[PDB]
Amino acid sequence: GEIAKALREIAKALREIAWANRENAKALR
Amino acid sequence: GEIAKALREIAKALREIAWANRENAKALRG
Amino acid sequence: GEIAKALREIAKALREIAWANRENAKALRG
Amino acid sequence: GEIAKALREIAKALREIAWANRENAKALRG
Amino acid sequence: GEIAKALREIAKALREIAWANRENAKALRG
Amino acid sequence: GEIAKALREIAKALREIAWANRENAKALR
Amino acid sequence: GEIAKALREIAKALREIAWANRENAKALR
């Protein structure tokens, strides 16, 4: 369904934030 | 539907946050 | 509808977080 | 409705995060 | 309702993130 | 219900992010 | 249900942000 597919896009975006934040920790190290 | 469209709007805004957070990592690199 | 309208405010608030985070990246760049 | 009201409360909390994050940018610029 | 109650805990958790992020801005000033 | 428990799961994860973010502030001091 | 599963995927992605942010605090220390 359209609602469940949108919620899965929100999850994917949050995983991209996690990856971006791991780039920061790398950058600090 | 209106609800699905608004949730996809939320996903897009979270992709904007991901891009901004990566620029923070790159500014610490430079 | 009231639920869709509130979801679109959530998206707008996330866009404001992205803007703030972009401001950080600029401040780090100096 | 109680769901819409709770979603608006989420949006307000996200606006608080945006203000906090901008203050991090202001504290880096000093 | 159980859904609205859960959404209000989401909002409360987000206000805790804002508070944590305001602590960061204070640590940077220091 | 399954939806409400999942939303409570989201709130707890956000409480983990608040703790982590505060640790970042503690590591600056 | 598909909606509850997608909400649980959102919670898992937020836990992945928390882990990133905990790592970021260790990299500052």
Numbering used by the authors:
A (entry chain F), F (entry chain D), G (entry chain E): 1 to 29
B (entry chain G), C (entry chain A), D (entry chain B), E (entry chain C): 1 to 30
Paper text:
Despite the requirements for aliphatic residues at a and d, up to 40% of these can be changed to other side chains without compromising barrel integrity. We introduced mutations at one or two of these sites to generate four groups of αHB: Group I had entirely hydrophobic interiors, but with different sizes and shapes of channel; Groups II and III had polar uncharged or polar charged residues, respectively, at specific points along the channel; and Group IV had aromatic residues installed in their channels. The eleven Group II peptides comprised: single mutants to Cys, His, Asn, Ser or Thr at d sites; and double mutations to His, Asn, Ser or Thr at consecutive a and d sites. Finally, one third of the designs were crystallized and yielded 12 X-ray crystal structures, all of which were open αHBs with fully accessible channels. Focusing on the small molecules, the αSA signal from the more-polar AAs and CHOs is dominated by the polar and charged Group II and III αHBs.
